[PDB]
Amino acid sequence: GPSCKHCKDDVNRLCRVCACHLCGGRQDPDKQLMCDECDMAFHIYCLDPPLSSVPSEDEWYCPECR
């Protein structure tokens, strides 16, 4: 083999390594921002504070990297 050792690519499992790094959820992939440093994914609405839309800038850095 799987791409992710932690969930073994099971779409019915939550996974904070290959899905939302905060909640593990796979839903709303168009709202999961990819960090341009660590490449973890983050639901805009799991961030604290939450972002109300997908940012327009080219790059974005998660709370663990900025």
Binding site: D30, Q32, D36, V54, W60
Partner: peptide, 6 residues
């Protein structure tokens, strides 16, 4: 920004 959908 890149999203998981990309």
């Amino acid at each position: 920004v890149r999203t998981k959908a990309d």
